[PDB]
Every structure is written in C-alpha cells, then in structure tokens.
Design a protein around this ligand. Structure first.
Ligand SMILES: Nc1ccn([C@H]2C[C@H](O)[C@@H](COP(=O)(O)NP(=O)(O)OP(=O)(O)O)O2)c(=O)n1
Ligand SMILES: [Mg+2]
Ligand SMILES: [Mg+2]
Length: 347
DNA sequence: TAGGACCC
DNA sequence: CTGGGGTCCTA
C-alpha cells in the first residue's frame, strides 16, 4: 500500500463562479476585485479569468493597473456569499468520497487515499474532476503525490483542468533546474537570499550543507528548506475542523488619514466588528493587536494582552484605543487593522 | 511581543 | 504604485 496525498484546486475559482451565472461573458477577460469599478485606487484584482491572465493580469494587481493592461475587461465586484456557497458545495462532494479531507479556505483541499500498489491514484483524481464538473460545473485540477507540499507543486503542473503525478521517481527530473521559490513555502525573499549565497536551483538547495541553511535561516527553517528541496513535506491529512487562532479586519482608506479622531474611530469600529464576529462563533478574546501603515508603507503592529480572557466591548475597544495611542502618529495613515487573538482552551 | 515571510 | 485575511518561526 501507499499513502497518496491528493491536492484538489478549483480553476480560476471566483471567475468560474461568475461565468457560471453569466454565459454572456464566456471567452471574455473577466476580472473580480473591489466594487467592480476599475478606476478606484487602492483596490486589487482578486481573480482574473484565464482570458485576462493572457494580458498579464493577476491576483494582487491594482484595478487601475489591470484596466491599463486589459481595457476591454469586464470587472465584477467580489461576491463572497456566492463563493462560500460554491465552495461548500465542492467540499461536501469531496468529503462524500469517504477519504480524509482537509479543507483550506474557499478553493482547496487535501484528500488522503491509502491505495494498494496495483491501484492508480490517477483514478481517484479522475473521479474527483468528473464529479466536481458534473455536479457543480466548476473545473478543478488535481496534484498527486505522497506529501502536501509536493502534491501542491504537482497541482501547478496539472493546471489547467488536469491531473499531474509527482513522486520520488520524477521529482528531481522535474524540479531540479527550477529556482527555489518553485517550492511551496519558499517565496521571493528566500529565493533572493539563496541566490546571493549561490544556491539558485531546487537541485542546489537539495544538497546544501545543513549548517549553511540553519545559520542563514534558523535551526528549524534551515532543515525545512532542505526537506522541501528534497521533495518532502507534511503527510498527515486531518479531517479535524480548523479552529481559528485569531480574527482580523483591516481597511485601506481611499485617502490617507491625518486626523487623530478619524484614526481612533476606525480602530474602534474594527475592534467592534471583529468582536461581534468572534462572539457569534462562541470564542473569547485573549489579546488585542493594532496595525498602522503610513503613506510610505511602513507597517508596524502592537499587541496587548487582556488581564483575563474577555468578550466585553468596552474593554476591547478601550484596549485597541490605548494600543493605537502607543504609536507616534499624525504622519499620514494608509491603513488601520485590528486583530483579536483567541482563547485556544475549551472552544 | 515584535517582525518578516508565505500563501490563498 | 502596492487588498484582505490567515499562520508559522526567528530574534
Ligand atoms: N493573492 C490572492 C490569491 C488568491 N485569492 C483568492 C481568489 C482566488 O480565486 C482564490 C484561489 O486562489 P488560487 O487557487 O491561487 N487561484 P485561482 O483559483 O483564482 O486560479 P487557479 O490558478 O487556481 O486556477 O483565492 C486572493 O484573494 N488573493
Ligand atoms: Mg484555485
Ligand atoms: Mg488555491
């Protein structure tokens, strides 16, 4: 037997959900992102359809920028409620296959399938794509491996509307020449730092001396980079439901704030909104964090612990406002955030 | 507790 | 010019 980890990922997820209720839009660049007004600054693309990516639009691109790259695009506001519902539908199908299923956010999931050696895991992936496409009309892609990060890499190669198997046998064949940020968990910064010490590919990283990595990145991350390069990863698929460690809301204002009372009032409001939401989820706050980002994109966060876990509005607002007040302010403010850390014990 | 990195 | 929302490890 083999413990396959299958990674299921919805294709161009938000655009697909839109397209599914808008046939007038097929074969057209559709871009999802922020009220649907491409002229608004400080708002980004959240999901570009494939047709739009052909113009170099991508998630995280400002709306103004996407409009410049793709002037004929149809821009639609983000409908979270339609997406939650489209996601739950896809999860229920995936969970109904009988395997352990570990759901991450709207779009993705790990399925664990312990299979006898004669059985092709590609058969389960084929079952998944069929059922998802037939019941929901969404297309997904499936990456197959024996750990999560490697399955996750496989899904990139399966894109779009396909299945790709990546194992110990072809791992290095396939990955060896690629830069390190091809690895899940390795982004641009690590790639840059690695290149500066002359490690420029997955193959290089995979044979780097452990001391070199642990000195440069830390005793755990250094060993982890080396495991990642060798094609290893997390391997247990848990069906246990995720319990959030925190909840948060941030706002980027249309115009930089300069008036203290305005800053006070946004932090109050975000503290209150987050608190109402956590209470509804039956949770209790332990710590309150405030984030301030200035016009220059300097972003600092302070945090204070409550004297006892609490849910009390007056206290949480008062704490968020005292934390705000520890920042040197006045200097124009681009963004304010409140994050509430939550009691892990009990609930 | 602060910060930086990554990912969706 | 550069969103919003999480989580993890390092100093
Ligand atoms: N920067 C990002 C990346 C993704 N997302 C949201 C919107 C996406 O449709 C959803 C899924 O992310 P994703 O799976 O990387 N990409 P998407 O499903 O849109 O297209 P594919 O490349 O998966 O086919 O997460 C986001 O809001 N911000
Ligand atoms: Mg996806
Ligand atoms: Mg995804």
């Amino acid at each position: 037997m083999t413990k396959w980890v299958l990674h299921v990922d919805l294709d161009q997820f938000l655009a697909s959900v839109e397209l599914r209720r808008r046939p007038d839009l097929r074969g057209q660049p559709v871009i999802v992102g922020g009220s649907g007004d491409p002229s608004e600054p400080r708002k980004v693309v959240t999901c570009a359809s494939y047709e739009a990516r052909e113009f170099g639009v991508h998630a995280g691109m400002p709306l103004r920028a996407a409009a410049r790259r793709c002037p004929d695009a149809t821009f639609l506001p983000s409908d979270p409620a339609a997406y939650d519902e489209a996601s739950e539908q896809v999860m229920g199908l995936l969970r109904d296959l009988g395997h352990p299923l570990e759901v991450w956010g709207w779009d993705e999931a790990y399925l664990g399938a312990d299979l006898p050696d004669e059985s092709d895991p590609v058969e389960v992936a084929e079952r998944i794509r069929t059922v998802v496409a037939a019941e929901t009309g969404l297309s997904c892609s499936v990456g197959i491996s024996d750990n999560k990060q490697r399955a996750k890499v496989a899904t990139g190669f399966a894109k779009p509307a396909g299945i790709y198997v990546l194992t110990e046998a072809n791992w290095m064949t396939v990955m060896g020449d690629r830069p390190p940020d091809a690895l899940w968990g390795v982004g641009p910064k690590t790639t840059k730092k690695l290149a500066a010490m002359g490690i420029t590919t997955v193959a290089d990283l995979a044979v780097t001396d452990p001391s070199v990595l642990t000195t440069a990145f830390g005793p755990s991350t250094g060993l982890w980079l080396l495991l990642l390069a060798k094609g290893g990863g997390d391997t247990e698929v848990s069906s246990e439901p995720w319990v959030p460690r925190s909840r948060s809301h941030v706002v980027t204002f249309p115009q930089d704030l300069t008036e203290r009372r305005e800053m006070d009032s946004a932090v109050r409001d975000l503290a209150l909104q987050t608190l109402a939401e956590i209470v509804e989820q039956g949770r209790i706050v332990t710590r309150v964090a405030v984030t301030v980002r200035t016009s220059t994109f300097y972003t600092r966060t302070k945090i204070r612990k409550l004297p006892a876990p609490s849910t009390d509005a007056g206290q949480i607002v008062d704490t968020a406002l005292a934390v705000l007040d520890q920042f040197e302010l006045d200097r124009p403010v681009r963004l304010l955030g409140v994050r509430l850390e939550l009691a892990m014990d009990d609930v």
